[PDB]
Amino acid sequence: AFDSTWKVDRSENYDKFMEKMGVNIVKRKLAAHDNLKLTITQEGNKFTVKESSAFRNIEVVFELGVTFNYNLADGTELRGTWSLEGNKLIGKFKRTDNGNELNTVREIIGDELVQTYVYEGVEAKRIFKKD
Numbered sequence: 001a002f003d004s005t006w007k008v009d010r011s012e013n014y015d016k017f018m019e020k021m022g023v024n025i026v027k028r029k030l031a032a033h034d035n036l037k038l039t040i041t042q043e044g045n046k047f048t049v050k051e052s053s054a055f056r057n058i059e060v061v062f063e064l065g066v067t068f069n070y071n072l073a074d075g076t077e078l079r080g081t082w083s084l085e086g087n088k089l090i091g092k093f094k095r096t097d098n099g100n101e102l103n104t105v106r107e108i109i110g111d112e113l114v115q116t117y118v119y120e121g122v123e124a125k126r127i128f129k130k131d
């Protein structure tokens with residue numbers, strides 16, 4: 001369902017989201033153009049996600065509901081879990097620097113992967129299409 005290669009198509013309020021997350025105006029400008037590709041593979045509860053962008057090419061492996069660490073592109077550490085809630089992946093992370101929650105949701109709406117992000121009151125969306 002999520003299992004596919006997804007290339008970002010458009011985003012909503014992502015600049016304010018990034019600015020709230022502490023991203024400087026130079027990397028925000030770049031990020032508007034990051035060309036984020038997610039390649040998601042699922043086996044039962046074990047997921048592999050290859051994130052490719054104009055910043056980096058990494059692979060993140062996680063299990064549903066097993067807390068893991070993930071470094072953002074500026075080296076900010078997140079600690080948290082992904083879960084399945086009905087049809088959605090639910091991400092509950094905290095930054096380990098200030099403990100503030102970064103909550104996120106992946107859902108398929110039609111043929112788009114829609115990822116919502118919420119951080120300190122600011123909500124953004126990134127929408128992906130199949131490659």
Ligand SMILES: CN(C)c1cccc2c(S(=O)(=O)NCCCCCCCCCCC(=O)O)cccc12
Pocket residue numbers: 017018019021023024027028031049051055060070072073074075076078082091093102104117
């Ligand atoms: C290169 N630099 C400096 C950056 C560019 C653009 C955005 C950046 C964000 S951000 O917070 O605004 N956007 C990224 C948020 C990702 C949060 C998702 C957490 C879920 C972990 C994903 C693991 C997986 O793929 O399953 C944070 C830190 C650095 C950023």
Ligand SMILES: [Mg+2]
Pocket residue numbers: none
């Ligand atoms: Mg992401």
